[PDB]
């Protein structure tokens, strides 16, 4: 564990029981040692770790993100003379850089130079950047067992796969694509307690991508007779891309040895099992092996359904035997990959919502409850309790449709957990006004918090108070991308609708790591907006954001400080668990911060990098709620 | 400071001294049925073993002082704590 010591001295005659400490003016104090520093004639002790932006002045009953930098005013005028009393200051970014942050990408610079991309830091010449995640540094400190705290998890997806800039590319977005090697986390595993690969699917799905469903179903049905195995209809689960999942070596932390990447949908099927599993999924098993080599086993998991593949949920509803066949494919998968700690489902619309391809009725929620119970029953019927699995679903926070989800019966039918999507509340391309797409906290004037100012706490309170659900059964997290909006006016939250907005790959969805590259910095031991891009924070909702005047472009985003706020709240609650959506594109600083928010403690005096200076707030402002502005 | 040089001038076996130093596994013991006052013991920072040797068993061999001499890791062979 980390450890530090200090000492104090007095005359041989005098022995204070308290830690005596030299009286001095406040000036950029820091660390763990006692400080009684003086300012404005008052005398101030932060009875907690000290940070270079924290100020005792405000600190008299503030000065840390949680409580009073308490004080007395014992200092006399001649003390205020012998020490030149401070009365104001401002911490600056230092000149040196205490730690490297990242490394450039040749190909991303080439990308910016591309005559279509034309990317620039200001985005003037190019609204998108398609920056390679390879730019990133490892950025994970190390931490104690800390068994009591709620579990930590992260989501993971296929976009880890490819950036043909590694392959030259140069002409199309995927050639300028994104992806990373899990080797990153592997270097220092147990970074989380659980993981969730992105929602996969089943035969018969309806959305745009369904040609993939067709293809894989074809490969399956062709293989099945040759394997001497029964054919499958709709509702049977799909792996989406076994070639990615297994027919891989790059990005999957394992030597190209045995990487028969040639194998594919028409051929993978014998290999469709953990023992044989090459590539990504196999590597994951190996990751867990290293993890256990230490101990503290990860909850390896994934789920199915989700934003873009939920379409068949209604269709499968009220088709009980096909639902049976579906869960049969579920348990079959379990048999094929008993490695898994659990897997879950990603139904998203008991009442219709999201993409319209998700056809839906009212009864959907009821039928969904029913089938869910039936799933639980099947699950219990297969599993041995010594190895039992317990299931979760996300939730949308749609004040009403969440009710329509009938969580009560889900709980009564052994659905153990819920993960609240805590992000993208700001439907930036269509939303009426700019707002924080991920605000946990209620701003003032809740009079309009129905399609706006959607403090998740409201739903939280519904479940706890208005639904009695124990916090244990509910989980929350954060995501590693902000929103971006054109022409927004900070006074009105009015903004340029439809106008194209910043993203490396996804307009309107600025990508955290590249923001670290472009707009924000910390190299000088601080939270540091850079390149003329405004760092800013609102007192109304504890909101945190970024701006640029030349295009009136705004970004709403979580921050180290802000995820700190979140995790600290959740911890104070003692929620069921904590996680991060889209974990694929943070260096890990937000995870280290997440440990801090969980109160999860580091295990050594050494660091991968510091984190304290990342919690100074941005440009303070008060933003009126939508209701406040309209009123 | 070298254990063997010492023992040789001593004309006596090093183990005798090691036992003098109680440095073997024969660690001191104390009854459960007594609690010593001023118990600055057992803290996560009370790393010293208790009872201490400079507090029990051979105290006189030290100035009733924390830095009791003991075996220390070999360098040019096994070694004595300090002068």
């Amino acid at each position: 564990v980390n450890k530090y010591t200090y000492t104090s001295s007095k005359a041989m005659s005098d022995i204070s029981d308290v830690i005596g400490e030299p009286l001095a003016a406040w000036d950029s104090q820091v660390g763990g040692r006692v400080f009684n520093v003086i300012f404005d004639g008052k005398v101030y002790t932060n009875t907690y770790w000290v940070e270079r932006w924290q100020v005792p002045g405000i600190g008299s009953s503030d000065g840390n993100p949680h409580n009073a930098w308490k004080f007395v005013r014992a200092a006399t005028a001649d003390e205020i003379n012998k020490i030149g009393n401070p009365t104001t200051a401002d911490v600056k970014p230092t000149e040196n850089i205490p730690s490297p942050i990242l490394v450039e990408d040749k190909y991303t610079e080439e990308t910016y130079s591309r005559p279509d991309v034309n990317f620039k830091e200001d985005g003037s010449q190019g609204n998108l950047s398609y920056t390679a995640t390879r730019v990133c540094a490892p950025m994970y400190n190390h931490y104690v067992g800390d068994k009591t705290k709620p579990k930590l998890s992260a989501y993971i997806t296929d976009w880890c796969q490819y950036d043909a800039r590694l392959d030259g590319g140069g002409s199309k977005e995927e050639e300028r694509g994104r992806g990373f090697d899990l080797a990153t986390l592997m270097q220092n595993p147990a970074t989380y307690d659980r993981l969730i690969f992105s929602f996969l699917g089943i035969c018969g799905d309806i959305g745009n991508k369904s040609k993939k469903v067709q293809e894989v179903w074809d490969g399956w049905n062709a293989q099945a007779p040759s394997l001497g195995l029964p054919q499958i209809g709709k509702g049977h689960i799909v792996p989406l891309d076994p070639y990615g999942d297994l027919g891989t070596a790059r990005n999957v932390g394992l030597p190209p040895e045995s990487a028969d990447t040639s194998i594919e949908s028409g051929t993978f099927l014998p290999y469709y099992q953990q023992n044989r599993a090459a590539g990504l999924l196999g590597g994951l098993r190996e990751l867990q092996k290293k993890a256990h080599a230490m101990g503290h086993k990860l909850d390896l998991a994934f789920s199915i359904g989700g934003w873009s593949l939920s379409s068949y949920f209604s269709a499968l509803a009220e088709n009980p035997d096909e639902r049976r066949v579906f869960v049969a494919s579920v348990v079959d998968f379990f048999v094929r990959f008993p490695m898994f700690s659990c897997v879950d489902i990603d139904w998203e619309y008991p009442g219709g919502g999201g993409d319209e391809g998700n056809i839906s009725s009212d009864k959907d929620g009821e039928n969904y409850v029913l089938l869910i119970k039936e799933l639980r029953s099947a699950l219990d019927s297969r599993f041995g309790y010594s190895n039992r699995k317990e299931i979760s679903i996300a939730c949308s926070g749609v004040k009403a449709k969440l009710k329509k989800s009938n969580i009560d019966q889900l709980v009564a039918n052994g659905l153990d957990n819920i993960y609240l999507m805590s992000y993208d509340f700001f439907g930036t391309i269509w939303a009426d006004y700019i707002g924080h797409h991920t605000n946990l906290y209620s701003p003032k004037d809740p009079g309009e918090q129905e399609l706006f100012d959607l403090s998740a706490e409201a739903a939280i309170d519904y479940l706890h108070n208005e639904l009695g659900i124990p916090m244990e059964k509910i989980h929350l997290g954060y995501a590693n991308y902000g929103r971006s909006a054109v022409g927004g006016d900070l006074t009105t939250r009015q903004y340029t609708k439809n106008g194209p907005a910043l993203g490396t790959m996804e307009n309107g969805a600025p990508e955290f790591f590249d923001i670290v590259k472009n707009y924000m910095d910390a190299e000088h031991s601080l939270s540091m907006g850079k390149n003329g891009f405004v760092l800013m924070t609102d007192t109304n909702a504890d909101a945190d954001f970024l701006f640029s005047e030349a295009k009136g472009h705004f970004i709403s985003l979580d921050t180290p400080r802000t995820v700190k706020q979140k995790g600290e709240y959740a911890a104070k609650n003692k929620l069921g668990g904590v996680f991060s959506w889209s974990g694929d594109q943070d260096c890990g600083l937000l995870a280290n911060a997440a440990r801090e928010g969980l109160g999860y403690v580091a295990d050594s005096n050494q660091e991968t990098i510091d984190m304290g200076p990342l919690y100074n707030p941005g440009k303070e402002i008060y933003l009126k709620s939508i209701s406040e502005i309209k009123s | 400071v070298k254990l063997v040089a010492f023992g040789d001038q001593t004309g006596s076996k090093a183990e005798e001294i090691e036992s003098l130093l109680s440095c073997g596994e024969n660690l001191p013991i104390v009854s459960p049925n007594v609690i010593f006052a001023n118990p600055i013991f057992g803290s996560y920072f009370n790393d010293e073993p208790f009872p201490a040797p400079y507090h029990f068993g051979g105290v006189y061999i030290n100035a009733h002082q924390r830095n009791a001499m003991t075996i220390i890791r070999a360098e040019g062979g096994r070694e004595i704590q300090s002068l």
Binding site: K289, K290, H292, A293 | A74, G77, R78
Partner: peptide
């Protein structure tokens, strides 16, 4: 000279599984 080392001490023999995921090739 009869130069002598210490005991073939126990250290702590540890009951734990055997795999290169447990045993170590170092490489």
């Amino acid at each position: 000279l009869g130069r002598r080392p210490d005991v073939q001490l126990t250290s702590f023999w540890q009951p734990l599984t055997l795999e290169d995921a447990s045993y170590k090739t170092d490489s």
